From a paper:
RBD, which directly binds to ACE2 receptor, is a major target for development of the therapeutic nAbs against COVID-19. To further explore the interactions between nAbs and S proteins, we solved cryo-electron microscopy (cryo-EM) structures of the S protein in complex with ten nAbs, in full-length IgG-form or in both IgG-form and Fab-form.
The structures are labeled according to the number of RBD bound with nAb as mono (1 RBD), double (2 RBDs) or triple (3 RBDs) binding, respectively.
Residue numbers in the entry:
A (entry chain C): 451 to 475, 487 to 494
B (entry chain A): 347 to 593
C (entry chain H): 3 to 127
D (entry chain B): 100 to 143, 153 to 172, 187 to 247, 264 to 297
E (entry chain L): 1 to 113
The structure:
Amino acid sequence: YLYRLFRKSNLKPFERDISTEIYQANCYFPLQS
Amino acid sequence: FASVYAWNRKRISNCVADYSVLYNSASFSTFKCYGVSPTKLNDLCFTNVYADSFVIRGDEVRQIAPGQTGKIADYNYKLPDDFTGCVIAWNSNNLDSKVGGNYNYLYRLFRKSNLKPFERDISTEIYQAGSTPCNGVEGFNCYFPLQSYGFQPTNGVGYQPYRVVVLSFELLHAPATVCGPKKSTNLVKNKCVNFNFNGLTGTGVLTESNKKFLPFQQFGRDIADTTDAVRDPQTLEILDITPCSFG
Amino acid sequence: TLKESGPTLVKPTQTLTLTCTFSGFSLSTSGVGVGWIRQPPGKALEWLALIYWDDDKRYSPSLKSRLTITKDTSKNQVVLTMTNMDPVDTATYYCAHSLFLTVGYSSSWSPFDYWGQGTLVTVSS
Amino acid sequence: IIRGWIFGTTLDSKTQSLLIVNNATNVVIKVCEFQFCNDPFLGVMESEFRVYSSANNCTFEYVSKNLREFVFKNIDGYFKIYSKHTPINLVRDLPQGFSALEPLVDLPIGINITRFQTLLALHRSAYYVGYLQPRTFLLKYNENGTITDAVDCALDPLS
Amino acid sequence: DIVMTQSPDSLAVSLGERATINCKSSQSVLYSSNNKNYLAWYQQKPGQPPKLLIYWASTRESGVPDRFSGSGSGTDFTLTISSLQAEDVAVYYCQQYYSTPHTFGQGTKLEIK
Ligand SMILES: *[C@@H]1O[C@H](CO)[C@@H](O[C@@H]2O[C@H](CO)[C@@H](O)[C@H](O)[C@H]2NC(C)=O)[C@H](O)[C@H]1NC(C)=O
Ligand SMILES: *[C@@H]1O[C@H](CO)[C@@H](O)[C@H](O)[C@H]1NC(C)=O
Ligand SMILES: *[C@@H]1O[C@H](CO)[C@@H](O)[C@H](O)[C@H]1NC(C)=O
Ligand SMILES: *[C@@H]1O[C@H](CO)[C@@H](O)[C@H](O)[C@H]1NC(C)=O
Ligand SMILES: *[C@@H]1O[C@H](CO)[C@@H](O)[C@H](O)[C@H]1NC(C)=O
Ligand SMILES: *[C@@H]1O[C@H](CO)[C@@H](O)[C@H](O)[C@H]1NC(C)=O
């Protein structure tokens, strides 16, 4: 049930974003168990 | 730095805080923000910021978080369950660890009851495990309550010293306090260009004036109460804010 | 660095001092001690006596009557006198250096950490 | 002789207060928890300052005839101070005339205030106190932008 | 009383090989106020005393090869000696202060195959 993504889009309504490119610069990932 | 059982407590106060120099310094091994994601720190204002400082092992940095357990979070330093600030941590093996063992960094390993959040306990009474009273002397079930990390430079990671700083933003009920830096930009006179003069938001053509404010007045108003002149904060000259052009 | 000095063959029923000569540490600071041990041959070991930093003395309750210890932080020694020799006490007699009894859930007192070597004792006329 | 005021609710410890002082050097604003003499003052050798005996927990510091008016107010954790220095041609009586007071300071303290005092330089070798109420006024502005006259609109029917 | 029952007696472990010794405490000897076992492993060389190898059951003593390492859980307590050298003809012990009397391991013959 790997929900809870984080991004740049801020997601104007009824659109959904699926992708994985890391917010790591210690490290981060746009997904959370 | 300061021990883990008597952490320090600096009360940062009214100023201009720039959490960006922190956030992007890339020298920090751990930068977690809980109440508020990190990039929006330089856009908010609180009443007080507290900064707590201490030194722990490498693999005890996961007990500095809301809702944990272990010898550190139980009775050395406890974070409330609705924390708001951020936790920063970086390795410091070369500064704090010395050959032969640095026995000056202690921690408490026995206490009667877990700490209340942000509570501090520097006493040194002989702990009493068993039922037998202790009378201030050591022995079975009568233990000194402080132990010392013996840090040494040839320690595997997770046993080398890490320095930790916990920023805690609080908001009592005052009128205001520290906030993040503002912005800036040049001034283009003569051209219906949107403008913001330290709070005054408007639109119009800006033009060199020939009125003279008193040396504490910022902007001028007309009859029927519309802003029609301003003073530039940096150069301190009066400029007429004539409405844009229309018809 | 402990070492148990003492005579090798003994005769019965008399009192007998025992010397664990050490170095490398003192013996009067909060968290330090030395425990005294025997082992007859083929048996498991038997600790006998113990003394901590402010001279907190322990002994076995069986030979509590006969065991009498004292630590020598200055000599880096421990004197333990001990009476009523008998041939079932044919053992070699050890000392072992205690350190931070907070760790004390690991050995049944049988060992400790330091540990010297041992002076042999045989009961024969 | 008038060498500043002291403000607060209790004018002691157990609660915070302001302290505004001026030795022969210059102004010293300060905000700690104090222990104030019940009759605090400063001497005039020229050794002085029997004002307090405690300066704990300071949360704000600062260092650096005649008629000297001041208006003190305290709104939303800000302590505002207006002032004006006019020269009289008397020595110590309240004159007549119009003179508007220009803002001086602004302190974001948060302090509660219910009481205040004064500080005087002793002898070793005249002042008034009004209070402010919510009124409605009509101010006449000059062409340079200064207030030259006013009307209090609750004095009489003409006003 | 918590008896410590060894693992392999007449151990015929080859040279440089993983020699295993288990220790079965009869009761759970864990002082739960540590989150860390305590156990002290020992090496009687013949004619010589047993010397402390690993205290805390994971913190090897000074000057000791890390090819020896301690393990175990609950009541089962193993010993991860990765290599049996020629110096390892010895007798071994496991114990617990978490008791009352002098509990003991019994001692193992280390034949080097
Ligand atoms: C704000 O800072 C700027 C510079 O960052 C100041 O500009 C200076 O103004 C003086 C005029 O008195 C010039 O002589 C300097 O050369 C200016 N410096 C620069 C870099 O241009 C400005 O005065 C400051 N604001 C105030 C109110 O003093
Ligand atoms: C169409 O493409 C856009 C790209 O910006 C995407 O965000 C959107 O989800 C796509 N449409 C649907 C129905 O997914
Ligand atoms: C004037 O008083 C302030 C109050 O603390 C003090 O700091 C200052 O030193 C005084 N002036 C001199 C010359 O000492
Ligand atoms: C104020 O001072 C008192 C006494 O010096 C002290 O107990 C108290 O902790 C101080 N206030 C704060 C916020 O530290
Ligand atoms: C000032 O005193 C009042 C007493 O009624 C109290 O309720 C109030 O909280 C105080 N001010 C502040 C900022 O706490
Ligand atoms: C101020 O006002 C006076 C009279 O109203 C006027 O003469 C003068 O030009 C103004 N400006 C000054 C003094 O700078």
